[PDB]
């Protein structure tokens, strides 16, 4: 039927990665980040930049032959926050509204088993 | 004399003529007088036995290891030191080991070594306390003590 890629979307609170690979993930087809669409650091992770980033990804996918993708959304993970950034919601909707077909969706955030020590100190970051 | 590690004299029979052969091995800690020492490919994993590197699983503590097959021991010969076997590459017949300096080395899996730690360890923990003690230490090593500072000449 369709030809599937894998849309590995890494949505932190400072940027948004829209990364489409093959099934194995060893071959990169298109990688457009929200920082390639804006010149201000404060909105590299904006929902608007993620939608533009996803559209460039979808356009690149079409000329190679990728007609559908699976979604593996992830946050920063590790010792930092596990909730995905604001751009992850926009890049998914933009991909679906761009004529690309959607397969399986999964959250693949790296979640530890109580691991190493998190930046900020005992008293946290004082603002 | 001149060695921190004690040496063991081990008597073997000669396989081809009626004669006893006395070998001088570096004593691993736990080796005792009257103990049976087994050396070869089919020797068992017991302290004091001499085995090829490929016959020892990872984590085996070994001493007097051969750098090259048949050189009769090059690595880890001083008191308290040993070699840890890191892993094997059976296709190329090679073994990765960790040396007392912390270096990783790749040796033929046919090279031999003696299971255990070299005896006499912990020698450096004690201060010499005297120039005379160092004099007697080097009295049976070589003429390298005392050292005059080049800046004072």
């Amino acid at each position: 039927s369709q030809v599937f890629g894998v849309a590995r979307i890494f949505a932190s609170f400072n940027d948004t990665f829209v990364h489409v690979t093959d099934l194995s993930g060893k071959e990169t087809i298109a990688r457009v980040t929200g920082g390639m669409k804006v010149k201000a650091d404060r909105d590299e992770s904006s929902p608007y930049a993620a939608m533009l980033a996803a559209q460039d990804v979808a356009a690149k996918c079409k000329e190679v032959g990728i007609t559908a993708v699976h979604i593996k959304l992830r946050a920063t993970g590790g010792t930092k926050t596990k909730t995905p950034g604001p751009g992850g919601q926009s890049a998914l909707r933009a991909l679906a509204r761009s004529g690309l077909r959607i397969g399986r969706i999964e959250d693949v955030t790296p979640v530890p088993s109580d691991s190493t020590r998190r930046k900020g100190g005992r008293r946290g970051r004082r603002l | 004399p001149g060695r921190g590690a004690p040496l063991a004299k081990v008597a073997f029979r000669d396989p081809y003529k009626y004669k006893l052969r006395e070998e001088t091995f570096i004593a691993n800690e736990g080796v005792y007088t009257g103990q049976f020492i087994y050396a070869g490919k089919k020797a068992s994993l017991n302290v004091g036995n001499i085995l090829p590197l490929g016959a020892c699983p990872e984590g085996t503590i070994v001493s007097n290891v051969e750098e090259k097959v048949g050189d009769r021991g090059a690595l880890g010969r001083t008191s308290g030191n040993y070699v840890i076997i890191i892993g094997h590459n059976p296709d190329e017949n090679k073994t990765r080991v960790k040396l007392p300096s912390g270096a990783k080395k790749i040796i033929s899996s046919d090279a031999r070594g003696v299971i255990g730690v070299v005896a006499g360890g912990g020698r450096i923990d004690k201060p010499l306390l005297k120039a005379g003690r160092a004099f007697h230490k080097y009295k049976v090593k070589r003429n390298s003590w005392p050292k005059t500072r080049g800046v004072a000449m």
Partner: protein, 214 residues
């Protein structure tokens, strides 16, 4: 400057006969040149595909299979079983409060000398007539269940080859036997083999693999 996608050749991925829908999908690699063949640099790739896709049914939506390619025949990729895992959301939806979570793992080798670590998970079951808020099992019972998990995974893996086990994993044969075997210890729910890892593979036998592809 060069558009590196003009030099890519597409290959088809074929799953083993243990699954139904054997047409997993397509991959690509740099085209075979004189210095480097495409074949040797293409084997060893791992594809993670949902088990619901390999069987059509949505009952397997929470399991995802790793398929390892280890033989290439023209434009077809002959993959083998590389591992099993649950989706992250399914596990997060099973770990509730006011109940006990029990886990076990065991390292065991198959008949054809495939060394695996198999991870089992289960939860205490609330009885239909239960009134109390929480459903906790005493630590002695949990030790017996954990012991019961290990001896069942050891028994049902060492007695069969990897291909029959693949046919065993799909219907939760081991999970259903653990639930049945622990009935006299404690009522259990959501008994699953939540992850399988291949640790060591035997010496490659292309003939054995080819029998798993038709």
């Amino acid at each position: 400057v060069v558009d590196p996608f003009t030099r890519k050749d597409w290959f088809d991925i074929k799953a083993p006969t243990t699954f139904e829908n054997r047409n997993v999908g397509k991959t690509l690699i740099n085209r075979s040149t004189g210095l480097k063949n495409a074949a040797d640099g293409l084997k060893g790739r791992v594809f993670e595909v949902c088990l619901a896709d390999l069987q059509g049914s949505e009952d397997h939506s929470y399991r995802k299979i790793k398929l390892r390619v280890d033989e290439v025949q023209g434009k077809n990729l002959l993959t083998n079983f590389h591992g099993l895992d649950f989706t992250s959301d399914k596990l997060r939806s099973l770990v509730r409060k006011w109940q006990s979570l029990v886990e076990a793992n065991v390292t065991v080798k198959t008949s054809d000398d495939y060394v695996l670590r198999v991870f089992a998970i289960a939860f205490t079951k609330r009885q239909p007539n239960q009134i109390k808020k929480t459903t906790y099992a005493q630590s002695s019972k949990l030790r017996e269940v954990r012991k019961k998990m290990i001896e069942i995974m050891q028994r049902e893996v060492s007695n069969c080859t990897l291909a029959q086990l693949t046919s065993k994993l799909i219907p939760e044969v081991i999970g259903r036997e653990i639930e049945k075997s622990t009935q006299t210890i404690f009522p259990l729910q959501n008994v699953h083999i939540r992850k399988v890892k291949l640790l060591k593979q035997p010496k490659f036998d292309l003939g054995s693999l080819l029998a798993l592809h038709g």
